[PDB]
Design a protein around this ligand. Structure first.
Ligand SMILES: [Zn+2]
Ligand SMILES: [Zn+2]
Ligand SMILES: [Zn+2]
Ligand SMILES: [Zn+2]
Lengths: 374, 376
């Protein structure tokens, strides 16, 4: 499996956002040998790659990221997350599902495709970033900004995110809910634990609020998007002393919202709940991504037939899960479709992917090239 | 100008964050040694301790206290360096300025004056000082007492210099304290993607309602001797910093200051009862810092009431409120215990400070306590 060997090379590079750690170079060196122009695009602390074979339309673009989320408790892993290994037909390692394996399949499919169909029409392109998981202010958004400024349009973009639920290709995504982040800093007053009346415990004041937020029903979603969901990712207060009341509480949370609400409606409803609990705080909001929905067209069609032909599965469209760089690509007018491995273990400890899906996914991606460009 | 202020500054300049003594006990010993106190340093683990004693016969009066201070943190919220003591509009600012280096200084100066005035005093005077009172406190005063007890060296009266006062100097003295039970609760979740919560277990979400209940729970109503049991969460942590990752675990550090209406095992049983109710998967590591204690009202209280009234015109009042102290380790021996010090208004806070006008009076009080117990 050429996909497996390339997967391992990428998986061995520790690439926690926004580190690339040679990943885009490894890819570029492959692509450069099969007629792709290599155009790296550094933006601050982020590395990006625009690779393109052909100068005429239509333009098919494979999108993805080389960065991975933090590993977590290193002693909770059964094997080093940056030392990939197979164990009972399962490939373990951070990025094994989200999404270094897809990256590899896109490259091998591209190579195999160019070999059997060298005089194909249109162009094939790769838009790869090293900051998709984080702020994403210097990633794919800046690449698009550059492409748009020189009128370089993408017709079809297939983001190799892990779209599947139960079996490979059972789900493909043409849209996504929005993503709204917040860092809440609740102010109290540092003091002695045995003299709470002379202090303000932020953990105590915020408790009822966090409890309320966690149970609050935001919307019921709609026929295109699941309901808005609330999640607290981080919470911190205190430095260690058991007899000291902390002066502040930091709470980091996020909304994945449907088109039934706007970032502004959510913000206002959240301040309204914090005000209701008589809190003294400050929030720093950040709109990570807008809800988006691209049209169902030939990319969806090419993918329905490729999936059915490789796996015998009837795929189903969805906007579920997280979001992707498709939010920065969709505004250009390209049809966006996400297709990858199972998302069962993404961002989890002992993240893995079934080896039996690597070659199929590679084949699926190859056949999509054939249906759209030959 | 004040000898008490002067020594206060000297002690204050030493960054003695639990359990680093940073020469404080040496500063104190060098002075006590010049007025007949034998100096017996007792280092246990990484904790320094001082048993200083003048005399070999009873009764035995003991000044107790700690040189360690709670952490400062480079918060920048400090108007002046916490280990660079200074005065502003008659207030001495610095970490430990109230808890409790000013008292240490006052005890030493009172001892020096008492000895100069009454060289032929009866009984003995001793200082039992530790560098770990604010922390785990396993290698501190508890060990000194283990040592004294094993060689039948008994303390009659023990005056702890913790900041006992509420509004004005010596308005409150404490002969007892509530217990102190600590816990580090680790709620076990399952790390994952925030947008795929059904495939994970957010421990912050699960614990949220349980914590909320713990904060609103009525543990007891206390009694005529002790205020009601209080619960406080001191620290809470989950997640590395990523916004799209559900953390695998939540760590919650909390404490109970409890009355004699409940026992540590009763509290422990209700907490698990409440956590299990919310269907949490967790482990708790408990640590009993101190048992509730109440010593008898005797000669020491009488000497303190008199001393205080004569110095400030204030009638002190008994109490077991606030936190706890090393009296919890001295009380089991039979010593009458009484805590008397400066205001506790700013202890464990940023910009901790003490009203300078209380230093000389506190010193006079200590000296008079000595006079009322060991002179006539
Ligand atoms: Zn991804
Ligand atoms: Zn991800
Ligand atoms: Zn103290
Ligand atoms: Zn203290």
């Amino acid at each position: 499996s050429d996909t497996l060997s390339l997967s391992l090379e990428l998986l061995q590079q520790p690439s926690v956002t926004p580190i690339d750690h040679t990943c885009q170079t490894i890819m570029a060196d492959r692509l450069a040998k099969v007629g792709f122009h290599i155009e790296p695009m550094r933006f601050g602390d982020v590395d990006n790659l625009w690779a393109r074979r052909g100068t005429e339309g239509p333009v098919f673009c494979f999108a993805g990221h080389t960065d991975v989320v933090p590993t977590g408790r290193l002693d909770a892993w059964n094997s080093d997350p940056f030392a990939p290994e197979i164990r009972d037909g399962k490939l373990y390692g951070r990025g094994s599902a989200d999404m270094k394996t897809a990256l590899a399949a896109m490259v091998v499919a591209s190579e195999r495709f160019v070999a059997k169909h060298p005089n194909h029409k249109g162009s094939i392109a790769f838009l790869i970033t090293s900051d998709e998981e984080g702020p994403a202010v210097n990633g794919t958004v800046k690449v698009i900004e550059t492409l748009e400024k020189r009128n370089e349009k993408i017709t079809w973009c297939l983001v190799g995110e892990p779209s599947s639920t139960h079996k490979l290709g059972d789900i493909v995504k043409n849209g996504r809910r929005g993503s709204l982040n917040a860092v809440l800093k609740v102010q109290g007053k540092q003091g002695h634990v045995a003299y709470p009346h002379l202090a303000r415990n932020p953990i105590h004041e915020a408790s009822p609020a966090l409890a309320e937020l966690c149970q609050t029903v935001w919307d019921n979603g709609n026929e295109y998007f699941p309901a808005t969901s609330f999640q607290i990712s981080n919470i911190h207060a205190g430095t260690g002393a058991t007899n000291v009341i902390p002066g502040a509480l930091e709470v980091t949370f996020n909304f994945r919202y449907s088109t039934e609400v706007t970032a502004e409606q959510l913000k206002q409803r959240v301040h309204e709940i914090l005000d209701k609990h008589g809190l003294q705080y400050e929030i720093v909001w950040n709109l990570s991504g807008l809800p988006f929905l691209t049209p169902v067209g030939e990319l969806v069609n090419a993918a329905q037939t490729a999936i059915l032909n490789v796996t015998g599965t009837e795929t189903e469209l969805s906007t579920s899960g997280g979001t992707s760089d498709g939010r920065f690509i969709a505004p250009t007018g390209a049809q966006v479709l996400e297709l990858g491995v199972l998302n069962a273990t993404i961002h989890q400890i002992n993240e893995h992917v079934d080896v039996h899906d690597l070659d199929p996914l590679t084949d699926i991606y190859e056949q999509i090239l054939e249906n759209l460009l030959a």
